[PDB]
Ligand binder design. Structure first.
Ligand SMILES: [K+]
Length: 270
């Protein structure tokens, strides 16, 4: 009955596998809608879905319409987006950089890191080939590209997650699961517990989610699928925690300092 948006990447299908297949209790039935994260980011601007995975940078733009669940998100220290190129670069000034979506946390972090580049916005899976073929000088990559970029002969220019850690001493908030405020407080709290249970179920029976992950990432090898969930699913996926809350506050403080997001007294989490 409730549409639930998330991406077909192994981390999201791993996290929602149990909830989608009735392996854990849910307060209401759910209808998954699998989309690219930038598509979900755009949809959230219109408040389209009542439940949706969203880039944390994008959540900062819809706090009056959505609240973040404490569970199901993507935050951490070794999950940062990377910038890659065909060879070392002195700087990104004046260079074309393929990016996965202007509303992504990846794009926001690249913008904190460097300011003289020319962004070329494309689907994330077009980035590695575009860099290798010389269509752009660098690429901001997310998802499973962090494991496959060497296959394209590329090198890491910067690991923005590491950059963020050095700058803030905190993990990097990448993606969150948001509930539309009009669903009501009780149902939202119940959904937060449901999502936490789904994460815990997959952590306890990972192999059970495998068919579902493959079904939505058919071009990926099982090796890449297992590496992807191992990298992106961690303690923060079960609960943002006190450190994750501090991290999100710092990310939003940086956004507010650049007029990218409007301040709000509303609590960040359910
Ligand atoms: K690898």
């Amino acid at each position: 009955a409730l549409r639930l948006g998330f991406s077909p990447c192994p981390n999201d299908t791993f996290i929602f596998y149990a909830l989608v297949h009735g392996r854990v209790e849910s307060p209401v039935p759910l209808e998954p809608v699998l989309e690219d994260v930038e598509t979900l980011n755009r949809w959230a601007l219109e408040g389209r879905l009542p439940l949706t995975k969203l880039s944390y940078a994008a959540y900062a733009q819809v706090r009056d319409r959505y609240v973040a669940l404490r569970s199901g998100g993507a935050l951490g220290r070794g999950v940062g987006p990377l910038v890659v190129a065909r060879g070392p670069l002195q700087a990104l000034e004046g260079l074309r950089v393929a990016v996965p979506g202007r509303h992504t946390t990846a794009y926001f972090l690249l913008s904190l890191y460097a300011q003289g580049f020319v962004p070329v916005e494309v689907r994330y899976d077009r980035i590695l080939p575009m860099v290798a073929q010389g269509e752009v000088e660098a690429g901001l990559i997310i998802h499973e590209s962090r494991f496959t970029y060497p296959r394209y002969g590329l090198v890491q220019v910067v690991d923005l997650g590491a950059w963020w850690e050095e700058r803030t001493g905190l993990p990097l908030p990448l993606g969150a699961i948001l509930a539309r405020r009009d669903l009501g407080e009780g149902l939202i709290r119940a959904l937060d517990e449901a999502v936490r249970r789904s994460v815990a179920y997959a952590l306890a029976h990972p192999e059970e989610a495998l068919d579902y992950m493959r079904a939505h990432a058919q071009e990926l090898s099982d090796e890449v699928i297992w590496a992807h969930v191992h990298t992106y699913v961690n303690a923060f996926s079960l609960d943002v925690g006190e450190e994750g809350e501090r991290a999100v506050a710092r990310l939003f403080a940086e956004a507010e300092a650049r007029g990218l997001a409007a301040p709000s007294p509303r609590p960040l989490f359910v």
